[PDB]
């Protein structure tokens, strides 16, 4: 079967994580974008919001199917019949905290490969975390990140929160 899974926490989802995303779509028939709870910090949107986001923004890609998932992504690669897990590398720094996740992932279910992805145009230069930060100082984002999500900061950063 040619079906991967893109799985991140996407929060929120950017120009540079679209990327991946398409450049993955255009290779194998059937992609699942997996929101991923799991993390080493608090998210800014929740998990439903993330995957709606993320929804609105690929609904014309046909082969795309956003979900959002309970247990570890190497189960969830599993059901889907996926053979292939995708990430982006933008910088050296990305290596180690990779290099762990795949190790991990190659002992649970060596059947499945980690692919990584260049950001090897001009989105390399931002992340999730300058988005979110510039964002929250009223600075333009729109060049980042798609209109829906663009919205979806000036939402979140009127409502009262942790932030
Ligand atoms: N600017 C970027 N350019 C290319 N690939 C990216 C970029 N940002 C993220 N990616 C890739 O897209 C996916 C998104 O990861 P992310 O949503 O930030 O969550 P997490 O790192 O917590 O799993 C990963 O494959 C990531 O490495
Ligand atoms: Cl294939
Ligand atoms: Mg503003």
């Given at each position: 079967?040619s079906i991967?899974?893109c799985?991140?926490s996407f929060?929120?989802?950017?120009?540079?994580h679209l990327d991946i995303?398409?450049?993955?779509?255009?290779?194998?028939?059937?992609v699942?974008?997996?929101?991923l709870?799991?993390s080493?910090?608090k998210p800014?949107?929740s998990?439903?919001?993330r995957c709606?986001?993320?929804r609105e923004?690929?609904?014309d890609?046909?082969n795309?199917?956003?979900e959002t998932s309970?247990?570890?992504?190497?189960?969830?690669?599993?059901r889907?019949?996926?053979?292939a897990?995708?990430?982006?590398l933008?910088?050296?720094?990305?290596?180690?905290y990779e290099?762990?996740g795949?190790?991990?992932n190659?002992?649970?279910?060596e059947?499945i490969?980690?692919?990584?992805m260049?950001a090897?145009?001009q989105?390399?230069?931002?992340?999730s975390?300058?988005?979110?930060?510039?964002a929250?100082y009223?600075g333009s984002v729109?060049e980042?990140?798609?209109?829906?999500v663009?919205?979806?900061?000036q939402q979140?950063?009127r409502?009262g929160?942790?932030?």
């Amino acid at each position: 079967a040619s079906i991967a899974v893109c799985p991140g926490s996407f929060d929120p989802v950017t120009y540079g994580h679209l990327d991946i995303i398409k450049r993955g779509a255009h290779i194998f028939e059937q992609v699942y974008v997996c929101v991923l709870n799991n993390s080493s910090k608090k998210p800014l949107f929740s998990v439903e919001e993330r995957c709606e986001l993320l929804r609105e923004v690929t609904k014309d890609i046909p082969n795309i199917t956003v979900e959002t998932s309970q247990g570890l992504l190497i189960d969830y690669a599993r059901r889907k019949n996926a053979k292939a897990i995708l990430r982006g590398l933008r910088a050296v720094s990305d290596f180690e905290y990779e290099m762990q996740g795949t190790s991990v992932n190659r002992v649970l279910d060596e059947s499945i490969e980690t692919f990584f992805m260049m950001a090897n145009n001009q989105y390399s230069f931002l992340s999730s975390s300058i988005v979110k930060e510039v964002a929250r100082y009223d600075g333009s984002v729109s060049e980042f990140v798609p209109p829906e999500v663009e919205l979806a900061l000036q939402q979140k950063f009127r409502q009262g929160g942790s932030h």
